Amino acid sequence: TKEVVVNVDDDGVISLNFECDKMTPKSEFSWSKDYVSTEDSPRLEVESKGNKTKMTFKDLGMDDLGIYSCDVTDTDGIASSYLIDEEELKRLLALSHEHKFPTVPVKSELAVEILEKGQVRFWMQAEKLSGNAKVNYIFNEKEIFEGPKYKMHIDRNTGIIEMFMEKLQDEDEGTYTFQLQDGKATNHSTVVLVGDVFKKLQKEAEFQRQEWIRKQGPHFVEYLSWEVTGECNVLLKCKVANIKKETHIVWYKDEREISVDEKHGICTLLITEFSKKDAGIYEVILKDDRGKDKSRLKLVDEA
């Protein structure tokens, strides 16, 4: 049957508990420490009610080490006991503390990356969130909010917490913290973006954002090169992508339109019987409402 059984309640309160089903109108609980009566001890309290007892420690510490025993009079004369040694003192103190001040578990800490539009993603993963969980966001020890600049999402099912930015200004260098609060539980994760790390990220954001826009338009996959063909003609060549019907393709030599394209992603201009007269700065421009691109190439005919 029964032993003495320990309990730590939601408020950190530590206690030993006992019940006996075989009591008599004259039966009584009596507790001892190291086989001396604990009656009158300032370190603890007892409460008996019907067939149950509880001993509540007032402030568990090192002066409470020992064997606690419970005897019941008018029974079989057998005592139940519980050992409190130095290792069990630690375990119970840790449990009390974590009840009073629980921690919200974290699977991975606050990290920062560059997504595909050149968008900046700040993220972390908690182990689990209730539906009441909330976050506050902090940059250089000041609170920041949902608006034109910071946009924030929390999925409570997976514990993914996110903040998005469109780019990194110079004034965005510094320290970022997510502060998490679920019940009476609590945590925070922090990331430092200073120096090399910060401009590593800011440079990469910039480049990808530009690239992504250029590419929604009609654009180059290979820039202007040259070769020789036929009877001493020069052909100019490039490669293009994302070409529509209304797309204007236009050639120039020294600021002066020469040819307008329409025919057929290879683009060529043929230069007939090449000489000094054919030298100059050549360029091709691509255009419509989705954006414009450009390739340039300089041609010397012996200067």
Residue numbers in the entry: 1141 to 1404, 1409 to 1447
Any passages from the paper?
Members of the myomesin protein family function as molecular bridges that connect major filament systems in the central M-band of muscle sarcomeres, which is a central locus of passive stress sensing. To unravel the mechanism of molecular elasticity in such filament-connecting proteins, we have determined the overall architecture of the complete C-terminal immunoglobulin domain array of myomesin by X-ray crystallography, electron microscopy, solution X-ray scattering, and atomic force microscopy. Our data reveal a dimeric tail-to-tail filament structure of about 360 Å in length, which is folded into an irregular superhelical coil arrangement of almost identical α-helix/domain modules. The myomesin filament can be stretched to about 2.5-fold its original length by reversible unfolding of these linkers, a mechanism that to our knowledge has not been observed previously.
First, we determined the overall architecture of the complete myomesin domain array, including Ig domains My9–My10–My11–My12–My13, from crystal structures of a total of three filament fragments: the My9–My11 triplet, determined at 2.5 Å resolution; the My10–My11 doublet, at 1.9 Å resolution; and the homodimeric My11–My13 triplet at 3.5 Å resolution. Although the structure-based sequence similarity of the five Ig domains is generally below 25%, all Ig domains except My13 belong to different sub-classes of the C-set type Ig domain topology. These interfaces involve loops that form the C-terminal tip region in each Ig domain, and residues from the first three helical turns form various specific interactions that shield the N-terminal part of each α-helix from being completely exposed. We refer hereafter to this as the “IgH” segment, which to our knowledge has not been found in any other muscle filament protein with repetitive Ig or Fn-III domains. Whereas long six-turn helices are found in the My10–My11 and My12–My13 connecting segments, the corresponding helices in the other two connecting segments, My9–My10 and My11–My12, are slightly shorter, with about four turns each. Because of the smaller length of their linkers, My9–My10 and My11–My12 show limited direct interactions in their respective Ig doublets, whereas in the other two doublets, My10–My11 and My12–My13, the neighboring My domains are too far away from each other to form an interface. The right-handed superhelix is defined by almost constant twist angles of neighboring My domains of 26–27°, except the arrangement of My12–My13, which has an average twist angle of 68° and thus appears to be less regular than preceding parts My9–My10–My11–My12 of the filament.
